[PDB]
Scaffold this motif. Structure first.
Motif, PDB file in Angstrom:
ATOM      1  N   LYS A 250     -53.183 -83.400  63.599  1.00  0.00           N
ATOM      2  CA  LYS A 250     -53.891 -84.578  64.145  1.00  0.00           C
ATOM      3  C   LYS A 250     -53.220 -84.974  65.500  1.00  0.00           C
ATOM      4  N   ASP A 251     -52.502 -84.177  66.188  1.00  0.00           N
ATOM      5  CA  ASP A 251     -51.867 -84.902  67.437  1.00  0.00           C
ATOM      6  C   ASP A 251     -52.870 -84.571  68.363  1.00  0.00           C
ATOM      7  N   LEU A 252     -53.793 -83.674  68.587  1.00  0.00           N
ATOM      8  CA  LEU A 252     -54.864 -83.459  69.623  1.00  0.00           C
ATOM      9  C   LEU A 252     -55.967 -84.813  69.573  1.00  0.00           C
ATOM     10  N   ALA A 253     -56.217 -85.160  68.446  1.00  0.00           N
ATOM     11  CA  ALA A 253     -57.202 -86.183  68.161  1.00  0.00           C
ATOM     12  C   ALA A 253     -56.633 -87.517  68.455  1.00  0.00           C
ATOM     13  N   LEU A 254     -55.343 -87.767  67.940  1.00  0.00           N
ATOM     14  CA  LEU A 254     -54.511 -89.042  68.454  1.00  0.00           C
ATOM     15  C   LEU A 254     -54.431 -89.178  69.883  1.00  0.00           C
ATOM     16  N   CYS A 255     -53.957 -88.034  70.520  1.00  0.00           N
ATOM     17  CA  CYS A 255     -53.990 -88.345  72.130  1.00  0.00           C
ATOM     18  C   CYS A 255     -54.897 -88.521  72.696  1.00  0.00           C
ATOM     19  N   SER A 256     -56.307 -87.994  72.250  1.00  0.00           N
ATOM     20  CA  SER A 256     -57.588 -88.115  72.792  1.00  0.00           C
ATOM     21  C   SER A 256     -58.029 -89.690  72.631  1.00  0.00           C
ATOM     22  N   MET A 257     -57.654 -90.064  71.416  1.00  0.00           N
ATOM     23  CA  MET A 257     -57.787 -91.674  71.170  1.00  0.00           C
ATOM     24  C   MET A 257     -56.879 -92.611  72.000  1.00  0.00           C
ATOM     25  N   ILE A 258     -55.610 -92.376  72.103  1.00  0.00           N
ATOM     26  CA  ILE A 258     -54.634 -93.067  73.145  1.00  0.00           C
ATOM     27  C   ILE A 258     -55.504 -92.962  74.565  1.00  0.00           C
ATOM     28  N   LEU A 259     -55.808 -91.794  74.992  1.00  0.00           N
ATOM     29  CA  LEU A 259     -56.350 -91.448  76.422  1.00  0.00           C
ATOM     30  C   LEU A 259     -57.542 -92.356  76.651  1.00  0.00           C
ATOM     31  N   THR A 260     -58.523 -92.345  75.648  1.00  0.00           N
ATOM     32  CA  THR A 260     -59.755 -93.277  75.728  1.00  0.00           C
ATOM     33  C   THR A 260     -59.439 -94.841  75.836  1.00  0.00           C
ATOM     34  N   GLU A 261     -58.342 -95.089  75.195  1.00  0.00           N
ATOM     35  CA  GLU A 261     -57.898 -96.526  75.289  1.00  0.00           C
ATOM     36  C   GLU A 261     -57.395 -96.965  76.528  1.00  0.00           C
ATOM     37  N   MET A 262     -56.588 -95.954  77.097  1.00  0.00           N
ATOM     38  CA  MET A 262     -56.270 -96.048  78.475  1.00  0.00           C
ATOM     39  C   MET A 262     -57.425 -96.139  79.429  1.00  0.00           C
ATOM     40  N   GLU A 263     -58.218 -95.205  79.366  1.00  0.00           N
ATOM     41  CA  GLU A 263     -59.326 -95.117  80.259  1.00  0.00           C
ATOM     42  C   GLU A 263     -60.033 -96.300  80.359  1.00  0.00           C
ATOM     43  N   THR A 264     -60.399 -96.932  79.340  1.00  0.00           N
ATOM     44  CA  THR A 264     -61.423 -98.278  79.256  1.00  0.00           C
ATOM     45  C   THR A 264     -60.677 -99.534  79.507  1.00  0.00           C
ATOM     46  N   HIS A 265     -59.326 -99.556  79.755  1.00  0.00           N
ATOM     47  CA  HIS A 265     -58.324-100.826  80.037  1.00  0.00           C
ATOM     48  C   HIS A 265     -58.907-101.071  81.605  1.00  0.00           C
ATOM     49  N   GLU A 266     -58.872-102.532  81.441  1.00  0.00           N
ATOM     50  CA  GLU A 266     -59.477-102.958  82.946  1.00  0.00           C
ATOM     51  C   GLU A 266     -58.581-102.646  84.026  1.00  0.00           C
ATOM     52  N   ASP A 267     -57.243-102.407  83.969  1.00  0.00           N
ATOM     53  CA  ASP A 267     -56.272-102.069  84.774  1.00  0.00           C
ATOM     54  C   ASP A 267     -56.329-100.613  84.932  1.00  0.00           C
TER      55      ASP A 267
ATOM     56  N   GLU B 163     -46.698 -97.001  76.075  1.00  0.00           N
ATOM     57  CA  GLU B 163     -45.755 -96.741  75.405  1.00  0.00           C
ATOM     58  C   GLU B 163     -45.609 -97.377  73.915  1.00  0.00           C
ATOM     59  N   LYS B 164     -46.302 -98.518  73.884  1.00  0.00           N
ATOM     60  CA  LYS B 164     -46.631 -99.190  72.587  1.00  0.00           C
ATOM     61  C   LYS B 164     -47.618 -98.301  71.802  1.00  0.00           C
ATOM     62  N   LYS B 165     -48.604 -97.993  72.226  1.00  0.00           N
ATOM     63  CA  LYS B 165     -49.553 -97.176  71.494  1.00  0.00           C
ATOM     64  C   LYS B 165     -48.818 -95.679  70.986  1.00  0.00           C
ATOM     65  N   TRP B 166     -47.882 -95.421  72.048  1.00  0.00           N
ATOM     66  CA  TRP B 166     -47.227 -94.069  71.616  1.00  0.00           C
ATOM     67  C   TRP B 166     -46.422 -94.298  70.381  1.00  0.00           C
ATOM     68  N   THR B 167     -45.469 -95.199  70.452  1.00  0.00           N
ATOM     69  CA  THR B 167     -44.648 -95.587  69.485  1.00  0.00           C
ATOM     70  C   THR B 167     -45.118 -95.906  68.201  1.00  0.00           C
ATOM     71  N   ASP B 168     -46.196 -96.792  68.320  1.00  0.00           N
ATOM     72  CA  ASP B 168     -47.003 -97.040  67.069  1.00  0.00           C
ATOM     73  C   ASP B 168     -47.739 -96.186  66.324  1.00  0.00           C
ATOM     74  N   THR B 169     -48.111 -94.919  67.145  1.00  0.00           N
ATOM     75  CA  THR B 169     -49.088 -93.710  66.656  1.00  0.00           C
ATOM     76  C   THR B 169     -48.012 -92.703  66.136  1.00  0.00           C
ATOM     77  N   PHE B 170     -46.764 -92.366  66.687  1.00  0.00           N
ATOM     78  CA  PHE B 170     -45.971 -91.471  66.362  1.00  0.00           C
ATOM     79  C   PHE B 170     -44.548 -91.622  66.141  1.00  0.00           C
ATOM     80  N   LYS B 171     -44.037 -93.023  66.124  1.00  0.00           N
ATOM     81  CA  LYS B 171     -42.275 -93.172  65.846  1.00  0.00           C
ATOM     82  C   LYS B 171     -42.330 -94.110  64.826  1.00  0.00           C
TER      83      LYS B 171
END
Length: 115
Positions: free
Chosen positions: A13-30, A107-115
């Motif tokens: 599931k690593d590929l799908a999960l990195c895609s989801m994270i990246l989508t959330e970064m893409e859609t952040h207002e900053d 870093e929070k999404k990363w830790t919550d997802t994988f650690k």
């Protein structure tokens, strides 16, 4: 070592999960300073100073075409985006603040997802 392996961490599931994270970064207002490559014709200094440019669109293309061998190489490119931002922008600028906020978000999404 040879014929002596650690137990197998499930990475399927690593590929799908990195895609989801990246989508959330893409859609952040900053995300706006980071969505596209810095235009090296129009921004003085950028080409010579930033030896490895990176941006979210380029990470998204790499992800989509099998250019990340594992989740650590993906996290290295994301961090490179923020490291470059700190190299070129003052902490007390809109873009410098954007970069600190996005790194924290990531870093929070990363830790919550994988650690």
């Amino acid at each position: 070592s040879m014929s002596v392996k650690k137990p197998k961490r499930d990475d399927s599931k690593d590929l799908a999960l990195c895609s989801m994270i990246l989508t959330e970064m893409e859609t952040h207002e900053d995300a706006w300073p980071f969505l596209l490559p810095v235009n090296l014709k129009l921004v003085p200094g950028y080409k010579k100073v930033i030896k490895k440019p990176m941006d979210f669109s380029t990470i998204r293309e790499k992800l989509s075409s099998g250019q990340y061998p594992n989740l650590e190489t993906f996290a290295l490119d994301v961090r490179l985006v923020f490291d470059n931002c700190e190299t070129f922008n003052e902490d007390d600028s809109d873009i410098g603040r954007a970069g600190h906020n996005m790194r924290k978000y990531f870093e929070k999404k990363w830790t919550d997802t994988f650690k």
